[PDB]
Ligand binder design. Sequence first.
Ligand SMILES: O=C(O)C1=C[C@H](O)[C@@H](OS(=O)(=O)O)[C@H](O[C@H]2[C@H](O)[C@@H](NS(=O)(=O)O)[C@@H](O[C@H]3[C@H](O)[C@@H](OS(=O)(=O)O)[C@H](O[C@H]4[C@H](O)[C@@H](NS(=O)(=O)O)[C@@H](O)O[C@@H]4COS(=O)(=O)O)O[C@H]3C(=O)O)O[C@@H]2COS(=O)(=O)O)O1
Ligand SMILES: Nc1ncnc2c1ncn2[C@@H]1O[C@H](COP(=O)(O)O)[C@@H](OP(=O)(O)O)[C@H]1O
Ligand SMILES: Nc1ncnc2c1ncn2[C@@H]1O[C@H](COP(=O)(O)O)[C@@H](OP(=O)(O)O)[C@H]1O
Ligand code: NA
Ligand code: NA
Lengths: 268, 271
Amino acid sequence: PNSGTLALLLDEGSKQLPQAIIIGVKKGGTRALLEFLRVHPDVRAVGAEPHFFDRSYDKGLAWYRDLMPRTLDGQITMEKTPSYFVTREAPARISAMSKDTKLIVVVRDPVTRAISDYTQTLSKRPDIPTFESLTFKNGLIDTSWSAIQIGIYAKHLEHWLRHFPIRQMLFVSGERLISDPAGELGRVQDFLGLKRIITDKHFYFNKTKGFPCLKKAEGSSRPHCLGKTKGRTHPEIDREVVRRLREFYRPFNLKFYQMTGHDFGWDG
Amino acid sequence: PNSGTLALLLDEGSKQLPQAIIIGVKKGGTRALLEFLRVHPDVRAVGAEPHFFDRSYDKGLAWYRDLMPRTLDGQITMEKTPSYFVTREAPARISAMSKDTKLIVVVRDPVTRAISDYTQTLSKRPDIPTFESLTFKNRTAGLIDTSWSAIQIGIYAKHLEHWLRHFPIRQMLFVSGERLISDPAGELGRVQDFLGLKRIITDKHFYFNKTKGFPCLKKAEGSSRPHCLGKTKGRTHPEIDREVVRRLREFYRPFNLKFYQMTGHDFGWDG
Ligand SMILES: O=C(O)C1=C[C@H](O)[C@@H](OS(=O)(=O)O)[C@H](O[C@H]2[C@H](O)[C@@H](NS(=O)(=O)O)[C@@H](O[C@H]3[C@H](O)[C@@H](OS(=O)(=O)O)[C@H](O[C@H]4[C@H](O)[C@@H](NS(=O)(=O)O)[C@@H](O)O[C@@H]4COS(=O)(=O)O)O[C@H]3C(=O)O)O[C@@H]2COS(=O)(=O)O)O1
Ligand SMILES: Nc1ncnc2c1ncn2[C@@H]1O[C@H](COP(=O)(O)O)[C@@H](OP(=O)(O)O)[C@H]1O
Ligand SMILES: Nc1ncnc2c1ncn2[C@@H]1O[C@H](COP(=O)(O)O)[C@@H](OP(=O)(O)O)[C@H]1O
Ligand code: NA
Ligand code: NA
C-alpha cells in the first residue's frame, strides 16, 4: 500500500467483532463461500479459522477482536470456523458476544459430507480402515462416529435455536454453491444486507479441477481456484453402504427441511 | 497463486492485443479510470503506460502483445497511454492493429487540465517560468502561445478530427473527468456499457477520503484493503492570475463548443 492509503486505515479504520459468522458445516463448502464473499467491497474476513468459540475461548474477546481485520464504516467483519455448528457451548458463547450475530451454515448432503470428512482424514492418516468399516458398529450404523454425527443437522440446529431466532440463520446449499455460485451468493448477500455485487461474471468453471473458480480473487488480479485439499477425489463407496446411510439420514433430512423451510434435494 | 490456478491461465488463457485503449487525455483522469475499471472481474490491464504507439512502435505488435497480461475468455485486455490522443501516427497505427479497437478519452476542462499539466512539470522542474509567462506569446496583445504543449493538448476538437479519419465516433467514448470525480460509479456505468461489460462496479466500490479530497476504492484490484491514488494524483494547483484564466477560457470556448457538438455531449466547461 501507499502513504495516503496506509494512513487512511490508521485514522478511519477500526476493528469490529464479527457481525456475521460462517459456523459450519465441516466439508460443506465453507472455504469456498468465504473466498467468494471476500470479493465484495463491503466484506473483510479473517484469513484463517479462528476457532475462538470452540478452542480458544480462554483467550478473551479482546484477543478475538485484534484478530479481526480493520474495516471502514459500512464493511462487515467475518470469520469462518466449521466446527462451531457442533460445539455444544458455541451457541451460548456467540449469543453472549452479541445476540444480533448473523449465522451462516453451508450444508451438504450428509452422505457425501461424511465421505468427504472421511477422505480428509485419510489424506492425513492413510492407514485408517475403509469408510465402509467405520460406518457400521455391527448392520447398525455407528452414530458415535463424528463423520456420521455431524451430518444430523436437525439435531444441532435445535441447540442453536435455543439461543438464536431462525431468521438470523442462513442455510446455504453446498451443492448449489458448486452448480450455481452466483445464485447462492445472491441469497447470502441479501441475508447479510449487502448490495448484490458478486455475480455470474465473477466465476469461471475449471473443467480440469471440476469446480468453479474465481475469475478474480480478492487478493489477486489473477483467477483463483481453491487448493488441492478442496475438491478431493473420494474413494468409491459400496452402494449398499450408500443406500443404508441415505436411509438413515432421510428422516433427519426431511425434519431439517421443515425447520429451515427449504428442501435441499438430498432425497429427491 | 497455486498449481490449479497457474495451470489454468497457462492452459486456458492467452495474451491478446487490447480490445480497448484509454488514449487520453493527459491529466484528464486516466489513471483513476483504469484503476477503477480493474476492479471488474472481466478487465485485465497493463499496469504501466506502454507508450507503444507513440514511442516504441518499432518494437512491433508481438512485443506489444507480450506486455499484456494473460486473460481468460470473456475478459477484456486494456492499457492506457495519455499521449496517444495527440500522437500524429497513433490513429493510423491503432487502426492497422485492429479497425475494431474501442477507444476511451477522459477529458477535462482545458483550463484546469493545462494548469494540472503545468503543475506536474513544476513538481519535476521547480525553476520553470510561471504559468502566466508560458501562456502568452505576447502578453500585452494577449497573443496566446498555442505551440505550448499545455495549451495544445486541450484543443480536443482538432485532435479528435484526426481520430475520426480512422475510427467511427461510435467506437470512441468520451469520459467526463469532472464527473469521474463527483460521481465515479455514475461514470463507470457508462464505461462498462460501452465496453460490453456487465455493470458490476457500483457505488459500494467507492469511499470518499476527506483528507485526500477525492474518492478512493474500498477495495483495489487484487487487494483487500482500501486504495486512494498516490501523491502525484490530485496535486494542489498554484493560484493563477484571474485575467489569464479568463483569457484562456475565452480561447477554448469555441473549440469546446465544437467538441460538444462532435461528441453529442456538453461537458459543462462553459456554463
Ligand atoms: O500511472 C500514471 O498515471 C502516472 C504515475 C506517475 O506518478 C506520473 O508521474 S509524474 O511524476 O509525471 O506525475 C505519471 O506521469 C506520466 C504521464 O502520465 C505521461 N503523460 S503522457 O506523455 O501524456 O502520456 C508522461 O508525461 C511526461 C512525458 O513523458 C513528457 O514527454 S518527454 O519530454 O519525456 O518526451 C512530457 O513533457 C512535456 C512537459 O509536460 C511540458 N510541460 S507543460 O508545462 O505541461 O507544458 C513541456 O515541457 O513539454 C514537455 C515535452 O513535450 S513533448 O514531448 O510533446 O515535446 O510530459 C511529461 C509530464 O507532463 O509529466 O510521463 C509521465 C511520467 O513522467 S516521469 O517524469 O517519467 O515520471 O503518470
Ligand atoms: N469452487 C470450489 N472449489 C473446490 N471445492 C469446492 C468448491 N465449491 C465447493 N467446494 C466443496 O467444498 C468442500 C470443502 O468444504 P470445506 O471448505 O467446508 O472443508 C469440498 O469437498 P470435497 O473435497 O469432498 O469435494 C468441495 O466439494
Ligand atoms: N479518485 C481520484 N483521485 C485522484 N485524482 C483523481 C481521481 N479522480 C480523478 N482524478 C484526477 O486525475 C488527474 C490526473 O489525471 P492523469 O492520471 O490522467 O494524469 C488529477 O489531476 P490533478 O493532479 O490536477 O488533481 C485529478 O484531478
Ligand atoms: Na475427518
Ligand atoms: Na506537464
